Amino acid sequence: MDENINFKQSELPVTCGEVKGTLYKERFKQGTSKKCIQSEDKKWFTPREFEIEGDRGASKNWKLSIRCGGYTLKVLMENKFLPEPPSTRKKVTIK
C-alpha cells in the first residue's frame, strides 16, 4: 500500500545519520548487494559502506543506521517498499 515515499520515481531519498543520498531502483532490487546511494561526493555507496559514513561503522545493523524518506530499511523491508525474501506474512503490525 506504501505511504508517502513512492519508489516509482526510480530515485528514493535516503538519509544515513544526516548523510542524505539518492537511491537507485536499478540496483535497489539487491539493496545491500548493490551500491545505489549517491552521496555528495559523486559516488555510490552500499547500505553498509553508507552506514560507515553516516554512523561510523560499528553500528553493525545497516537496516537501522540508514533511513529512507522517513522509515529505515529495516521497516522498508518489513512493510513492502523493498522486495527481499518472505518478509513475514499477512496482518502484520507496522507499516
From Swiss-Prot:
It comes from the Eukaryota. The major isoform Sp100-A, has a calculated molecular weight of 54 kDa, but exhibits aberrant electrophoretic mobilities, with an apparent molecular weight of 100 kDa. Sumoylated. Sumoylation depends on a functional nuclear localization signal but is not necessary for nuclear import or nuclear body targeting. The HSR domain is important for the nuclear body targeting as well as for the dimerization. This is Nuclear autoantigen Sp-100. It is found in: Nucleus; Nucleus, PML body; Nucleus, Nuclear body; Cytoplasm. Widely expressed. Sp100-B is expressed only in spleen, tonsil, thymus, mature B-cell line and some T-cell line, but not in brain, liver, muscle or non-lymphoid cell lines. Together with PML, this tumor suppressor is a major constituent of the PML bodies, a subnuclear organelle involved in a large number of physiological processes including cell growth, differentiation and apoptosis. Functions as a transcriptional coactivator of ETS1 and ETS2 according to PubMed:11909962. Under certain conditions, it may also act as a corepressor of ETS1 preventing its binding to DNA according to PubMed:15247905. Through the regulation of ETS1 it may play a role in angiogenesis, controlling endothelial cell motility and invasion. Homodimer; isoforms are able to heterodimerize. Interacts with members of the HP1 family of nonhistone chromosomal protein, such as CBX5 and CBX3 via the PxVxL motif. Interacts with ETS1; the interaction is direct and modulates ETS1 transcriptional activity. Interacts with the MRN complex which is composed of two heterodimers RAD50/MRE11 associated with a single NBN; recruits the complex to PML-related bodies. Interacts with HIPK2; positively regulates TP53-dependent transcription. Interacts with CASP8AP2; may negatively regulate CASP8AP2 export from the nucleus to the cytoplasm. (Microbial infection) Interacts with Epstein-Barr virus EBNA-LP; this interaction is important for EBNA-LP coactivator activity. The chain holds residues 595 to 683 of 879 of the full protein. It comes from Homo sapiens. Residues 2-83 form the SAND domain. Induction: Up-regulated by interferon, retinoic acid, TNF-alpha/TNFA and lipopolysaccharide (at protein level). Up-regulated following heat-shock.
